[PDB]
Amino acid sequence: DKSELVQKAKLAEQAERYDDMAAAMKAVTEQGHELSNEERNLLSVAYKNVVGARRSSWRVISSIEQKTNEKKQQMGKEYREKIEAELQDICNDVLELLDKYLIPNATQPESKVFYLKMKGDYFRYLSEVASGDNKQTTVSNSQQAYQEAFEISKKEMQPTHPIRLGLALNFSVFYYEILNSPEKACSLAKTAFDEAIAELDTLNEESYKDSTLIMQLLRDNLTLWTS
Amino acid sequence: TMDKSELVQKAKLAEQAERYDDMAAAMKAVTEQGHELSNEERNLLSVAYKNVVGARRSSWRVISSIEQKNEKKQQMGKEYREKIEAELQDICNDVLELLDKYLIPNATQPESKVFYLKMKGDYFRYLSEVASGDNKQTTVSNSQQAYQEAFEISKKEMQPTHPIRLGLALNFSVFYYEILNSPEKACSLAKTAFDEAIAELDTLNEESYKDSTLIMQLLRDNLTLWTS
Amino acid sequence: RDKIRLNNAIWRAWYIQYVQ
Amino acid sequence: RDKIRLNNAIWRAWYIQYVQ
Ligand SMILES: O=C(COc1ccccc1P(=O)(O)O)NCCc1ccccc1
Ligand SMILES: O=C(COc1ccccc1P(=O)(O)O)NCCc1ccccc1
């Protein structure tokens, strides 16, 4: 029962068993229809946590490796590669759901932006640990997805919509952390932040909490990047 | 597929990356090569499984609390909790296996025997907490008996300020109070351990100072809370 | 150490609470 | 938590420290 995968997910969330949560929402997604906004939020939180645990581990192992003997430095690399291969499996799973179910079934323009952003993200996460030819593919595919979302975001949503704001936040991180373009990063973020200030008026009760957090984050990032 | 030095050291890396399942799998493997364990190794082992088991116990309590809130909605709290319960019984049985086949059988010096006997009490304690009435009498009784035997050895062969002796008293007291609902016992057990340790606070070894005083503070934390 | 002690208290407290 | 701003600052700072 779908309504039931869904409450397995909610339970797994509460218990902090994010791998269970993701596999449930993956099964819901494979049932082929458009996701409710609540199902879509659960899927996204599930996988953000599942991939973030691994990226965090990957970062820890990598920090240790620089900090450093050979037999040890080698097991550092082997353990990182075990983490890398889980990251690739997590992200491929999500990008396949995006490619086959969520982006094709995405009718409302705010859905297509959300999922194209999600594809930019998971291709960004692949890029953070990719090598050589495959890095260029991942980085290119992440920018394509972000940009396609960032053009629909301007034609269909206001500068205060939390999905438009989140896309600007994450695209700015892509420029800063993946393309290594601090200036393109800091401008994308400032613009989106100023554009939403100059129309704070517009924030429906329902959007207020989320959009303000994202603008706080956009400003926290800009503050940090001018340091 | 590798060597003690190698596995021990992916265990440390797994710890820092907080991948405790990886960490416990690493130290299970070093345990099975049968070679008896450093203090360093024994502790990485204990830490790995305490976190592995601890995650499932925390999750079980979360899911339990929620079941205390639809014939099939609650049918799922029940199915999910039982998924966790099964994970938790598997973890405990894997650790119980290693204890009975490898660690207790080679426990040469009394420090080690007490340590692993406590673990046996600990992991039968955790089985008891979700155990199904049939076993629950047996996991309790296994738990008390592992603990009592560690208790006996530790009173005769270790200082009141040894951190292993104190941690055992901490967990045995917890066992009385939370498994055998005998606060009078648990409380008396925790008081005597704290009291006999502080009495010998002039020969508490420097090496042990941080751990033994932490455990003494937790005994005091739990005595205070068990009297509220 | 404060972290350790407070996690312990939360853990022991859950018992006095959710199964009294 | 809504340790979100903190955890995000920690995350963005990592890239800065560990990729100069
Ligand atoms: O956090 C807890 C209690 O709750 C748990 C949580 C996870 C797994 C097991 C347990 P426990 O065996 O029932 O106590 N610390 C108590 C044990 C301790 C001894 C020495 C130093 C620090 C702590
Ligand atoms: O903590 C982080 C950044 O670090 C990460 C850690 C784990 C997974 C992904 C990421 P990210 O895509 O690179 O940002 N929060 C940023 C995401 C966010 C957006 C809106 C509201 C709240 C938070």
Instruction: Look at chain B and report how many structural domains it folds into.
Output: 1
What was the experiment behind these coordinates? X-ray
Residue identifier of the C-alpha nearest atom 1 of ligand 1: C8
d(CA A167, CA A63): 28
Under 8 Å between Cβ of A14 and B66: yes
Query: What is the distance between the alpha carbons of residues A80 and A60, in angstroms, rounded to a whole number?
Result: 9
- The answer to whether the Cβ–Cβ distance between A224 and D18 falls below 8 Å is no
CA within 13 Å, CB half, B47: 18
Question: C1-20: string of b/e by CB count within 10 Å (b at 16+)?
Answer: eeeeeeebeebbebbeeeee
The span from the CA of A21 to the CA of A43, in Å, is 8
After which residues, if any, is chain D broken (C to N > 2.5 Å)? Answer: none
Cβ density class B46-76: b for 16+ within 10 Å, e for less: bbbbbbbbebbbbbbbbbbebeeeeeeeeeb
Q: Which one of B10, B17, B22 has the shortest CB-CB distance to A60?
A: B17
The Cβ of residue A122 has, within 10 Å, a number of other Cβ atoms equal to 26
Q: Do A213 and D4 touch (CB under 8 A)?
A: yes
A217/D8 Cβ within 8 A: yes
- The pair of structure tokens assigned to A88 is 């690739």
Domain limits for position B90: 4-226
CA–CA separation, A28 and A26 (whole Å): 5
Q: Domain holding A211: CATH number?
A: 1.20.190.20
User: Are A97 and A26 in contact, with CB atoms under 8 Å apart?
Assistant: yes
With b for 16 or more beta-carbon neighbours within 10 A and e for fewer, the A13-50 pattern comes to bebebbebbbbbbbebbeeeebbeeebbebbbbbbbbb
Q: Do residues B186 and B177 make contact, with C-beta atoms less than 8 angstroms apart? A: yes
CB contacts < 8 Å between B and C, how many?
A: 30
Q: How do the residues of chain B divide into helix, strand and coil, expressed in percent and rounded to 5?
A: 80, 0, 20
Nearest to residue A118, comparing CAs of A47, A192, A193? Answer: A47
Q: Measured between CB atoms, does B226 come within 8 Å of chain A?
A: no
Largest CA distance in chain B: 62
Q: Is B67 on the interface with A (CB under 8 A)?
A: no
Q: Which atom of ligand 1 is nearest to the CA of C11?
A: 4
Q: And the tokens for A30? A: 């494979």
CA angle, B51 then B54 then B58, to 5°: 140
The CA B173 to ligand 2 mean position distance, Å, reads 43
Q: Is B217 within 8 Å of C5 when comparing Cβ atoms?
A: yes
Token readout for B79 is 């199915």
Name the DSSP class of B102. Answer: I
Buried b (16+ CB within 10 A) or exposed e, B181-199: eeeeebbebbeebbebbee
Ligand minimally distant from the alpha carbon of residue D3:
2
3-state secondary structure A89-152: HHHHHHHHHHHHHHCCCCCCHHHHHHHHHHHHHHHHHHHCCCCHHHHHHHHHHHHHHHHHHHHH
Cβ-based neighbour number of residue B164 at 10 Å:
22
Please give the residue of chain B at the shortest CA–CA distance from A70.
B6
Q: Which amino acid is at B187?
A: C
Please name the residue whose Cα sits nearest to atom 15 of ligand 2: D8
